[PDB]
Amino acid sequence: GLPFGLMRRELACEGYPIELRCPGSDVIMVENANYGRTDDKICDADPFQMENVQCYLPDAFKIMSQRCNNRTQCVVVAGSDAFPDPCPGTYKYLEVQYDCVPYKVE
Numbered sequence: 001g002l003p004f005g006l007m008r009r010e011l012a013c014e015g016y017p018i019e020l021r022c023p024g025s026d027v028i029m030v031e032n033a034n035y036g037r038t039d040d041k042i043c044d045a046d047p048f049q050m051e052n053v054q055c056y057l058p059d060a061f062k063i064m065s066q067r068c069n070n071r072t073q074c075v076v077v078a079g080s081d082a083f084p085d086p087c088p089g090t091y092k093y094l095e096v097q098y099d100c101v102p103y104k105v106e
């Protein structure tokens, strides 16, 4: 509860599962998301794996959208066979931005 007033967003360290939940009877609506690494300050791991801060995966968006779209809550593995590999040997992550809208009207 208590919206952020600036879209909802969840991020999870590669290899661990991520959780999305919408308030009341709203449903998750994935707007944008990416699987990879664009920062070295998230999910502190070995420096060698955190050196590359430039890894993107567009399809990451479609995967989460299909999995969380129109759902009140959804859980996905921020790694494993649930996400390809846009940059091996690096500690990745998953960032998903979405909004919660009513499952019907009002």
Ligand SMILES: *[C@@H]1O[C@H](CO)[C@@H](O)[C@H](O)[C@H]1NC(C)=O
Pocket (backbone or CB within 6 Å): 065, 066, 069, 070
């Ligand atoms: C969610 O529901 C709306 C209305 O029924 C539909 O247009 C939309 O396509 C659904 N989400 C997805 C991913 O299809």
